[PDB]
Design a binder for this molecule. Structure first.
Ligand SMILES: Nc1ncnc2c1ncn2[C@@H]1O[C@H](COP(=O)(O)OP(=O)(O)OP(O)(O)=S)[C@@H](O)[C@H]1O
Ligand SMILES: Nc1ncnc2c1ncn2[C@@H]1O[C@H](COP(=O)(O)OP(=O)(O)OP(O)(O)=S)[C@@H](O)[C@H]1O
Ligand SMILES: Nc1ncnc2c1ncn2[C@@H]1O[C@H](COP(=O)(O)OP(=O)(O)OP(O)(O)=S)[C@@H](O)[C@H]1O
Ligand SMILES: Nc1ncnc2c1ncn2[C@@H]1O[C@H](COP(=O)(O)OP(=O)(O)OP(O)(O)=S)[C@@H](O)[C@H]1O
Ligand SMILES: Nc1ncnc2c1ncn2[C@@H]1O[C@H](COP(=O)(O)OP(=O)(O)O)[C@@H](O)[C@H]1O
Ligand SMILES: [Mg+2]
Ligand SMILES: [Mg+2]
Ligand SMILES: [Mg+2]
Ligand SMILES: [Mg+2]
Ligand SMILES: [Mg+2]
Lengths: 369, 378, 372, 369, 369
DNA sequence: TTTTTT
């Protein structure tokens, strides 16, 4: 009796358009959920779903001013909203969703039931997601000389693996692991490896979240921390110096809650979902404002005790007692890392550790020693 | 002489669109009053109410171009405004309201006369709002370990219940409450249980509205607690260390009046309604600017003395003077809260406490014998 | 011909649409002058007036496209502006205008030559406007408890009544009465009673109108007092502490002028009409930035000296010298007030006081002896 | 070849629509040049002018849709721009123009030749613009009470009259005047009398034109005094105390120039024409940022020394050296001025003073003593 | 097949519409190129050009709806941008372009070759462009009084004339002139003379271009000086006070480049072409945030010494050190200057000065003394 | 920063 309404009714049965909690629609195209507020794309999904429709229904969609009518009817039908990003054990890529429990990679409408609005930013590659390669053993050699597999450096290696694998889970973690070691120890190597691995779900911030107040006016580094899965806090100054700013313990207490309070510039929204694994890359032993039982409850430390030096100052660092092993610095290492070399090898290693430490239940524990 | 005008008149005779004092249009879709400031929701209602109309009238509302003519007529016929949210003892859900007087759940046109423009955000399940379940047994055990029923902890427990049961009444409360205890005592667990129970009527604000003036420029932290029924302020710092402000005594008194003054960004609205119970989750005793009788009578305190240490620091916690029980930490408890396992059990408990305490009149009372400075001035 | 033009010409002869000096179009719907700056509601009037047009004309006003044509014609017809709100002794309601000189209520065309643009927001009931009722005796008992009718408390009671009754006049007042008293003395109760009595003509603003400037950028806290007949600034803080600003005397001098300068957000209009009785509900004595003869000419004080206590702390109150009387707190009074139970009893009381203090000339006077 | 085009051509030949240099579209309707950017009013003129057209053309202008075609044609036809408000000694009303040199009143095409785009807002009544009347006799007593006609108050009275009468001239003045006196001296009464006399040619702004920067962002407190002939500022704070901002000495120099740089919200026009007499009433002597010969040549002061007091405080006022006379307060005068009682009487007085002080040349002089 | 397309093709052959590089659409009507993003210039030109077309085409251009289709086609056939305002020694008037190095005045199609997109705003009358005239005598007397021809004031008068005549050449300059002097020395008189001479090529801005960063959102104070040949920033404040700004030398660097950056409201044109001579009439010596040797290479100062006083204060000025003459003041001078009395006389003098210093090359040199 | 823009 009235087509352009049966077309809209049929489109609404595939659940390709959803209404979110923020009052704006999300569209499922190119095997991804994307937001409508930026570019109008409820249309151009009609042109895409045109082929899954009867012949006499698909001819009417080759015309503007008729797709706008269909879009109006579709918009007048979505009343109730839905919640997004509810599954913490799924890793969303740019062309599918990887299951962290089994390791299977879902594409198409299989990776649709999980309303994942975030992504790594790069596409997957199953041919590179394999154990043996002229690149996985390079990575294992790169890792094994940063945290040696000895029984002396056994629990430190365990904590290292646990933190690195926990940077995949999309859930609130209460812990503030420190990466403590002298210069040229490999901390930035791990940071760049992780950034190459998990991609866009990664953030490198400054000192201001550990020393300043969090809700005095707007806070730019709070809104971009929404739904991220790993946060690095390098560039730590010296705190043994005179009159230097100390690490605010209340800041530590505020950064482990499931919801962080703060707003960006020119915004009325004050709430954020905390999914991040905050890691502090320090060079000196951290000292805080005050020490109490509520602070020792949210801190862990990982020690880096291996130096990498050129033959120039090899023997000078040999007699140093801050290290446990000295090796030769490689110059092409950073260039190889920045070219996305060990991306999928590191991803495979992280998944292997994840389904070894957190597969019954995901949690982090403090080591106030 | 017009059929799209008769459609609009018939719709307007069902009282499904209303105009409010703030200037917005509210519609009744899916057993709830909904509105959207940026884009009106009248045409959604026109498409939804299509079935109640006769056949020749309903067949015309399948065209987007005619639902605009109908909407224009409806906008022109609505002249006078109405008052909103005038019933305190009614808890609105996404599919009806619950009467706190007797515990009956209404839907349809029985829920429409209470023009409640807020809701918890979820649907009400009848089969889970019961007192016979394993979930209720677990919840009662958890609550009885957080706040034991010993005779030396009888007043405190009662206050506890009252305060929590206050978060269901949409009226102005003239008292502020403190949740004061040491680490690992159960304050955050209570906060998360309450949030899971009452949904979108719960808000978490910033420390900034205890210590900063509330009128210089835009303050979205004040304007966001409009018609909310529970406001939590967490992580109060120590007032002795560096960079520490003090709790302004005038802000405490401002956050007890039925109307608070404060505006959001890019806005000219400077008045908000106060229906909230304000709880400050602290770890050290609060320190105020000045002390007088007007600050005496708006402050209450609840104590948390029960530790939850893992069986490694058990003896060290047994050595502390701030705890009375050192019960074992449950590791999976924080997982079966965010999954809304104890949602309706805690709802039933809150309704029971509300019936017990706030049925004649809802009113909170101060407890000034619990603060050091207040004791000195007492 | 153009029957759509004749309809506009016929509407323009009933004087139901007017153009104001600020650029607004005010229409006359349901015995009230209304306007909406963002959405001009002329088509509302076009639809609601069709019953007064002949049969052949009223049928053409059911189309939403023909109403726009009629509205465009009406817009082109109106050229000259008019001035509004020029009668200070009239009280506008949602369905008429009450004359404070003789207590007569006007409706229809009689209550239309007073081009009032503000209102209380509620209707006027003539059955609840009686002198004798149970609500009236309850209200009188409440008021005589807040301000007793003794002989030492005689000037205070007169000032109280004068201020509360002057909150009805739509003219300019030079004075800044302070409601001063200790805790639980009945200041907020009086404020809420006045709120319930006068409806939308009541506004409550922030304290920045007393301690900040009124012209650095937008200020909706001051631009919202346009044509309001009562303004409250409740619960001023203490000035003895360090870090507290003082009350600026220039802000006091600006707030007693017929026109106050200040603009809202995204607005180019900088002028407001001051019709307000400003009351500062305070618990400590005010501390000013500077004292001179020009400041003491605009300030009055009303004291509150009756405590309302729970039976527990009744004894400690009678030892305090800040109270002259102690009574029992009523737990169900604020809920009764919030339900507009005494809405018309208090209105009758205020009108009775108005035709006792302000009927020849409406003017407020300072009391410089009170402020230390 | 077109009916709605010939209509626009005839309306253009009438010379009722013009284009100013600023970019506005003034039109001549009801014996007045009017304009409104927020409310274009060419269609008002099209509808109002149909009577001066043949019958076959006037019946086509009853359609709101057909008036917009004529307006579009008219907008296309106007290529060149003209300059407005070039006569300083003409006072425009709602229904004509008054010549200040001879006292004549013009209407119709006699008042159209002076492109006066501003107005008082009210009509000129000749039955009230007379010299003998009870209103004139009351007004003379009021003014002689405020400023007595004695021999030590002669120069002050002359300066008072000069400043008040200069508010009718549409030229640029080179002085700022201070109304200095103590409390209850008659300054606000003078302001209200002048306001009721000159109507919409009067404006009141804030103190940010004196102690602030006039160029940052939108400033509608400086862009509202465009082509106005009187600007008032009132209630200056005490500057000898603390917490006060001194009067910026360069703001004084900018305000005496023929044009002032400032723009309102949502507009690009950054130049406003200065025709105004600026008067600053105050209770204390002004305190400036810096004193220089370039400042003292732009400042004049007139003093108010009559006190109006209630019968209870009269005794304590005769002992004050800030007053030279104590009259008795009239309670009903404030409401009598609000109702525009002494409007045409005060206008007659102002014109009489003007054609005594400003006929050869209009210039204002400073009093640096 | 399309009449409204053939009309647009015909109009595109007359070369009456051009597209510049920023995106401006300039049109040629009334013997002058014009552009205005607000006014509808193309639909004005379409209606004005309808006569130089066949009769069958012309009658269609009387409808405002068809004049929009023609302009829509014209905007689509304009794909290539042309460069404009390349002749620096031509002065554009309202009816033609005057050559400075030769003295001829082209008009009509003769002036269309030089795409001079700006204008003085007034027509050029040759009869008043004569060397000998009473107005020339008065003007020479005035300019000689303002700056005398003494032997010590010859290095200053040459720079005065250089910077005054450089306001006619439409090309980027490299200096910022300061007209420094005491009170009542003649700086504003020179400014008014130059304004009345060069008309619409003269713009006046605020001090925010000096003391504020000119890269924040819309900024019509910077966007207004596009292709203007003179800019004034009168009345800078004294910077040795209790809280003051500085001239922000980086702005001085940005104000000498030929592509100063700034955009107006509701527009996306950010690049403005710098053709202006920036002059600031201060009363005190300027002070900057920091001083380098690059600054003094682009700063020039000219002094004013003659004092124009009243007979009341003639004696006190003869003892002031910062003066050389105490010549008597003239009152009716400004009124004559504001009436464009010495417009063409000053124009002739400026041209005579121009063909004396800038004939080989227009360069402005600094004065660091 | 916000507000203005937009
Ligand atoms: N009844 C209970 N039985 C067992 N474990 C519990 C019980 N109640 C709470 N817990 C757990 O014990 C821990 C107590 O931590 P919280 O109460 O959330 O922290 P807290 O009280 O806010 O102390 P802070 O935040 O450090 S001042 C959490 O891991 C809870 O999940
Ligand atoms: N006549 C009355 N009889 C009994 N109770 C009263 C009466 N008037 C007021 N009350 C109650 O007594 C209490 C007094 O509180 P308020 O009226 O707010 O006094 P207050 O001056 O506002 O005190 P604060 O602390 O400065 S806000 C309230 O609970 C009133 O409801
Ligand atoms: N000629 C007059 N005869 C009688 N009363 C007068 C006269 N002129 C003014 N008044 C009244 O005297 C009172 C004081 O005059 P104002 O105009 O307020 O003086 P003022 O300069 O404004 O003093 P401020 O504002 O406190 S600094 C007002 O009530 C006037 O109505
Ligand atoms: N050559 C002249 N002969 C006669 N009068 C003159 C001459 N030059 C200027 N004047 C007048 O003398 C007065 C001097 O004012 P200006 O020169 O404009 O002020 P100024 O030099 O800018 O000093 P400022 O602006 O106060 S710091 C004006 O009224 C001029 O019209
Ligand atoms: N496993 C490794 N084998 C060889 N060279 C390494 C290895 N890890 C790091 N390096 C080199 O040693 C340097 C370590 O510095 P970096 O990782 O930045 O330490 P830090 O972050 O503590 O300064 C890097 O430049 C890197 O090229
Ligand atoms: Mg590094
Ligand atoms: Mg906690
Ligand atoms: Mg109160
Ligand atoms: Mg005054
Ligand atoms: Mg000057």
């Amino acid at each position: 009796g009235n087509k352009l309404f049966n077309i809209a009714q049929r489109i609404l049965d595939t659940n390709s358009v959803l209404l979110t909690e923020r009052g704006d629609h999300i569209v499922w195209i190119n095997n991804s959920w994307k937001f409508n507020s930026e570019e109008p794309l409820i249309t151009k999904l009609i042109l895409s779903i045109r082929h899954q429709l009867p012949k006499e229904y698909s001819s009417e969609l080759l015309c503007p001013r008729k797709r706008k009518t269909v879009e109006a009817n579709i918009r007048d039908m979505l009343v109730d909203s839905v919640e997004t990003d509810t599954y913490p054990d799924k890793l969303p890529f740019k062309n599918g969703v990887l299951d962290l429990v089994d390791g299977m990679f879902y594409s198409g409408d299989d990776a649709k039931k999980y309303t994942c609005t975030v992504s790594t930013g790069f596409k997957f590659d199953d041919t590179k997601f394999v154990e043996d390669s002229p690149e996985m053993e390079e990575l294992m050699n790169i890792i094994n000389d940063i945290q040696p597999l000895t029984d002396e450096n056994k629990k430190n290696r365990e904590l290292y693996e646990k933190t690195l694998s926990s940077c995949l889970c999309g859930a609130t973690k209460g812990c503030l692991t420190f990466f403590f070691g002298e210069t040229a120890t490999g901390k930035s190597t791990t940071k760049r490896l992780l950034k190459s691995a998990i991609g866009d779900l990664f953030v490198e911030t400054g000192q201001t979240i550990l020393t300043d107040v969090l809700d005095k006016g707007p806070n730019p580094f709070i809104a971009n921390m929404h739904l991220k899965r790993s946060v690095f806090c390098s560039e730590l100054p010296d705190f043994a110096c005179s009159g230097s700013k100390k690490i605010r313990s209340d800041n530590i207490k505020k950064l482990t809650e499931p919801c962080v309070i703060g707003r960006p510039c020119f915004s009325n929204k004050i709430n954020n979902r905390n999914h991040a694994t905050i890691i502090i890359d320090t060079n000196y032993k951290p000292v805080f404002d005050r020490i109490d039982n509520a602070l020792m409850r949210r801190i862990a430390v990982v020690r880096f005790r291996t130096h990498f030096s050129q033959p120039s100052g090899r023997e000078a660092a040999e007699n140093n007692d801050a290290y446990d092993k000295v090796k030769l610095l490689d110059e092409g290492l950073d260039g190889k890392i920045q070219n996305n070399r060990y991306r999928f090898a590191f991803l495979y290693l992280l998944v292997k550790w994840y389904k070894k430490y957190h597969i019954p239940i995901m949690k982090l524990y403090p080591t106030p020693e």
